[PDB]
Design a binder for these strands. Structure first.
Ligand code: ADP
Ligand code: ADP
Ligand code: MG
Ligand code: MG
Lengths: 794, 766
DNA sequence: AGCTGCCAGGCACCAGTG
DNA sequence: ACTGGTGCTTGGCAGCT
């Protein structure tokens, strides 16, 4: 209603504004007007509430006024942060043209869009956490999925088979922004995820993605990257790249590759395993008391992020795991020397992303130069270490003698945060800049001489010479002496208690000082953009050096932990099996104020399922987890919390624990995934669940399930249960064996020994645990009477 | 031994070391060291080599309210000499910015005799002062959960520290603050009494010790008299239905299991219109009273006000939060809008009096009197304050014209002088011929004539230049500084007067504070009763009757929350519990409706005992002392500990609701405990119990022993799914559905087949 | 060391001569 | 159609106390 708001009824300003806002209909538009970014209509109302700024209005000759808000251009970063923390994208519009030569409103382009998965600036990101853009897509048969780390170039592609692998892939990558195709059927994977972004179907067309990705990589086809085979993934990867290009609107030279992640190249862990193993996130949501809290004492941000990627994605290549282990063993003695030097390399990876996007600030290049200064010390230290993988990483990190020198001669020791104000480029780097700097010590040299000279000539002791941004340079005299000033003194600015003047000499100095300051700032910015021109050709080798430095940090880290926390090197056997001697839960052993009871395990194709019994709090769940963490750690190359481990190949880890609406339904569908997708190479942890509607309702299914895992699938299965009935299984079924966690009953109390023993328990301790919980003794007596009745059945 | 500015910060922190210290620094308050680290964690702000964290001045009240909501006291240190000029503690705030509208905010004190416990709460806004002497650990943990103090005073030597350890706002105090002769003296002097007999607490030494410490703390925190605190009341165990934390949490009274406010009993029942009414309604929900006298009176009121709720609720809405506004009148912190709202509420009382005049109900007519009229104070504020005054009195414009002759006089002179300076602008503008000429006002120059730069050179020679701007010149003349004196001295005399007339309004209002407090409380209760009357009528509730002996007879009853939330028809169900039929063993499916049927029993009992009508065609109900709930979900240990608590503390007047006790351990162990639990509850305690179980063996109970019956729910298979029927019918169940749910989960058919075989095998020995 | 209010640079608006 | 004056976000700081 009201105001038919056709093109002609709008002002030149609003015509141009709505045109640019139409290119970004559903996200905020910062709109450059002089020294402000301004928002309008609903953008202004929302921006007012989110940014906590005033909602005002611009006047209008045609109809209703225009809602309005905005912030000074020099304060954008603070408000951009406030927005991105809440998941808001923002289009940044700048003025391109000169207002002095524009008849109407000046040309305005959107130069970039800040979205939560495409941020590369240091103040909007978290140091030790990745921030990944992603694209997902589904059709009849399966999924395609891509991730990009814009602040590094790591571009990945996968084709998860089913709902549960896709779920576990979203869990593992944890994207900050998720682009998804409009026809996505399984919204239950995607709903209530952050930075969610519905995208047209055409953005996932295969021919277009192949064209765009080959263009980006400079290849004819993607044979060389291992993804020509993989249209499902490619379609997601296409949408992803198109988004990235649209948000940055510059070339993205740091995205020179893409890699497919195949199912069989890593150990797939279902979403429950990840949570129950508490790899980077405990069950309460926080980061305390995780696997990563204990294992992660990396000394640089990029190293930490790399370690967590490895923990979340164990590899199956025997060769890569052996090399990682050797590195850990070879570098163990040189931990204390290598670590303070690696710390000084910093997050070189993210600085190089900003270099590639041309957004690198003067303190970015200073820390890049500081990193180069650490390379010869690290080359010397790694020379002595006779390990082929250690020397390959020493080669990969390079030295960059010529660039370390370039940055030392071009930038101040400690430059400002930004280049806008100057003071970044050093003396000697450019001859023209130094003769344009005849000004910085031309001022107060000259102005103090003009002050004293005119103070003495005039005889007026209050006379001083100053500058003011608005009125320029001046000669100030006090009000009480101002009636004595020369008539030559042209009057410039008046104040309450002082008059200020200008004279032909000082005006001439004002014009020249300011023209040359503008010339010195423009040249400085030309020279700083030129630093990018000379650094960028070496981008590949630099990215390789960051990666080698980050991997060094991970491995030097894992070496130190292996020593400090008493870990041993695992070996690998040809067939399924796990043989542990005196193994411990790597996390529970650290947090426990008292000694962790170490425990064995024998698992093999002959001894492939263990039924685990023992009282509540007896240590059954812990024993299972620590098996899986030891498997996990072994398959990232790391040493392991035990006296000795021998471990076969694993394809998948499955965890089924107790549980939204119907708890038995969900527990049963989670069990079905396990029975449908497990193999002879999978490790399977089955913990206690809810009962069915009746007594033996659920035990029936636990028996039938156990037997399917023993007899059909033949996976390696630990099966913790309170059902003592399942201790008869070994008798009846090949591959199945009883173990139990020990407990001494002594008098009216129970002690939990946390020690695994072969065989079933002697008894179950339900009544005992209940008595520990404070159930009246008369009730426990009655329950023990009822128990004898039930035990006389057989 | 640090920098000159940080030498002052450290000495000031020594005065209040246990409290976070805001320290003024230009446009920011700034915290240092352990204050900076703790506050960056609590408030989501940065950490800056001295640690520092800063809040901007313009949002100081928002961030004070965030810290105070997490149990933190906060000292502010303003101006160069400095001093702690303000302190907010969580349990003693009364400012609308720092308070949540619809949540109570209590100060509390706790302490321990060899004889037992002492407890005391205070709502510093309402004046509501309560004490108790819980008999043991579990009852004291129960009063702590329910009252939920924002700040808890406690003795140095408190032995039972596990009761309060995790709580926010813990304030360790000396033992001499709980000395009893000093507690009586201070309390009597606060109340104007000689003994505490009239408040019914003269013989409650443990309780008074806590209330004395509480009072001293509140006083020290305000440095004002607290005249609105004129009474104290003692809650006794017999007076209410006790509920432990687990039960309070499982019945989801005001807070759902995920910490939210949605899908709770309060979300449905609480449609009150004033914030003071909502608070009173939630106090009732969490404290069912057992005195049927009080209960019959609320019922009567709920039925008598049936045809009067459409008329009353719009009017009551406009009364607003008169309770919290009166607190600020008592503390002399009330602002012009506080007085404006008090006026608007007085403007409603005549209409409310006429509407209630016809209501045939003795309790409504007494609330109608207690409500009062206050026509003289309504006139005062009508004449004294303008229609919509500014937030603060600071800048005047709050006193109306006609109220004071002296004030009108100074305003007429200030207006006359600004009228002359407007005419001065127009006169000087024609005389010079300079169209840009105007008169502005400033702090640093006062009044001045401005002329644009381009025209400034044609300024008359009698003008004296004072400020050059980028594109203008500002001058003064003797005429300007003469009429500047005229406006400034007039506006200032009229500002000091307004301020003194404002203070005078407190002198005239406060003499009637006691009756005003009774009016706001009565208006709150009306709001509650009228809400409950609208609820009963709208939601098809009925009025329960009370019987002398334990028993719950429900006809077609429902879960009051579940029925409003889901868009599927709510199947109503019966219940007949009596001394002859004390326990029901509930069998049947998962998602079958057991937990709902148990919880609705408890909700109906709870609602009957706040005086409300109930979701049912009929409910008769005997006395209940306690409601126990062991419903939902190391977990086995926590469930056994709750089970243990029930068996120790339940009586024959208790409602006990148990769910799948036994699941977690072995079949024989779990069944053995379940059996022996049923037995105890059924034979020893004789509590009216509902025992949901999966053990079908437990259905043999009714045959073995008296007062035990089977009931069950069933399901129905059709199409490609299950239809759980949600209808409770007599007898044990004859079907399980676990295997059926596994089939629909995708568990392979061949696994199901093997389980079917194994189930028949397993059941046949029974 | 603190309060106030001009200024930053884009537009459009509006009134006063063309 | 042309001149010269108004208006509006917030952060920085000159210019007064
Ligand atoms: N082997 C161990 N040594 C020392 N403490 C242990 C060990 N295993 C478990 N615990 C402790 O026992 C507690 C309960 O163990 P849990 O595995 O959950 O028993 P269950 O699952 O059988 O009921 C854990 O909190 C852990 O701290
Ligand atoms: N009487 C009923 N009429 C309609 N819906 C019901 C009824 N009883 C329960 N429900 C709904 O069915 C769901 C599952 O039943 P539930 O209360 O959990 O019993 P159980 O312990 O057997 O699973 C509940 O979440 C509730 O919303
Ligand atoms: Mg367990
Ligand atoms: Mg239930």
């Amino acid at each position: 209603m009201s105001a038919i708001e056709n093109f002609d009824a709008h002002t030149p300003m609003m015509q141009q504004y709505l045109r640019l806002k139409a290119q970004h209909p559903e996200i905020l538009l910062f709109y450059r007007m002089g020294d402000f970014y301004e928002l309008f209509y609903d953008d202004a109302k929302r921006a007012s509430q989110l940014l906590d700024i005033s909602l005002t209005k611009r006047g209008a000759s045609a109809g209703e006024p225009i809602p309005m808000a905005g912030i000074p251009y020099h304060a954008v970063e603070n408000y951009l942060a406030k927005l991105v923390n809440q998941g808001e994208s923002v289009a940044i519009c700048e003025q391109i043209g000169d207002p002095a030569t524009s008849k109407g409103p000046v040309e305005r382009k959107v130069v970039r869009i800040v979205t939560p998965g495409t941020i590369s600036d240091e103040a909007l990101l978290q140091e030790r956490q990745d921030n990944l853009l992603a694209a997902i897509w589904q059709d009849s048969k399966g999924f395609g999925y891509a991730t990009l780390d814009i602040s590094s170039g790591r571009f990945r592609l996968s084709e998860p088979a089913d709902r549960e692998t896709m779920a576990a892939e979203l869990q593992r990558t944890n994207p900050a922004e998720l682009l998804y195709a409009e026809d996505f059927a399984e919204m239950s994977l995607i709903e209530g995820r952050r930075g969610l972004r519905r995208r047209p179907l055409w953005e996932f067309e295969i021919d277009t993605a192949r064209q765009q990705l080959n263009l980006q990589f400079g290849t004819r086809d993607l044979v060389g990257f291992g993804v020509e085979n993989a249209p499902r993934g490619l379609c997601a990867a296409g949408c992803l790249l198109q988004y990235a290009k649209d948000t940055q609107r510059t070339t993205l030279p740091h995205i020179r590759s893409i890699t497919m992640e195949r199912e069989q190249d890593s150990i797939i862990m279902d979403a429950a395993t990840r949570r129950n193993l508490e790899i980077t996130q405990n069950l309460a949501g926080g980061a305390e008391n995780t696997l990563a809290s204990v294992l992660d004492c990396t000394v640089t941000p990029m190293g930490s992020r790399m370690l967590k990627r490895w923990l979340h994605m164990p590899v199956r290549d025997t060769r890569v795991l052996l090399e990682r282990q050797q590195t850990i063993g070879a570098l163990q003695d040189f931990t204390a020397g290598l670590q303070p030097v690696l710390r000084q390399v910093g997050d070189l990876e993210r600085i190089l992303a900003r270099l590639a996007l041309r957004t690198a600030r003067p303190r970015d290049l200073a820390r890049m130069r500081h990193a180069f200064q650490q390379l010869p010390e690290l080359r010397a230290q790694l020379e002595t270490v006779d390990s082929a993988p250690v020397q390959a990483l020493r080669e990969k990190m390079g030295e960059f003698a010529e660039l370390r020198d370039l940055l030392e001669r071009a930038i101040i020791d400690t430059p400002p945060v930004l280049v806008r104000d100057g003071g970044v480029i050093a003396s000697g780097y450019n001859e023209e800049l130094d003769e344009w700097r005849a000004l910085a010590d031309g001022a107060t040299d000259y102005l103090e001489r003009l002050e004293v000279r005119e103070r003495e000539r005039t005889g007026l002791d209050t006379l001083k010479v100053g500058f003011n941004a608005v009125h320029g340079y001046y000669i100030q005299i006090s009000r009480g002496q101002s009636h004595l000033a020369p008539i030559n003194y042209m009057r410039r600015q008046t104040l309450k208690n002082a008059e200020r003047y200008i004279i032909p000499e000082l005006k001439e100095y004002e014009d020249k000082v300011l023209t040359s300051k503008g010339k010195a700032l423009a040249l400085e910015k030309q020279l700083y953009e030129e630093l990018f021109d000379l650094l960028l050709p070496h981008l590949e080798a630099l990215q390789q050096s960051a990666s080698a430095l980050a991997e060094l940090d991970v491995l030097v880290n894992l070496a130190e932990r292996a020593y400090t926390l008493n870990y041993t090197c695992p070996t690998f056997i040809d067939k399924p099996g796990i043989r542990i001697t005196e193994g411990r839960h790597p996390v529970v052993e650290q947090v426990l104020n008292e000694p962790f009871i170490a425990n064995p395990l024998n698992l093999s194709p002959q001894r492939r399922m263990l039924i685990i019994t023992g009282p509540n709090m007896g240590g059954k769940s812990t024993y299972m987890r620590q098996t899986a963490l030891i498997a996990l750690m072994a398959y990232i190359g790391s040493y392991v919390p035990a006296q000795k481990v021998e471990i076969g190949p694993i394809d998948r880890i499955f965890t089924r624990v107790g549980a939204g609406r119907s708890t038995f339904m969900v527990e049963m569908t989670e069990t079905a995934n396990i029975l449908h997708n497990a193999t002879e190479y999978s490790l399977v942890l089955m913990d206690e669940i809810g009962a069915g509607t009746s007594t033996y309702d659920g035990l029936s299914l636990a028996w039938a399930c156990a037997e399917n895992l023993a007899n059909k699938i033949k996976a390696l299965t630990l099966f913790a249960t309170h059902y003592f009935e399942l201790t008869q299984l070994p008798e009846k079924m090949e591959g199945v064996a009883n173990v139990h966690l020990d407990a001494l009953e002594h008098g009216d109390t129970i002690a939990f020994m946390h020690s695994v023993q072969d065989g079933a328990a002697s008894k179950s301790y339900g009544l005992a645990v209940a008595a520990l919980a404070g159930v009246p003794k008369e009730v426990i007596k009655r329950a023990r009477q009822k128990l004898r009745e039930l035990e006389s059945i057989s």
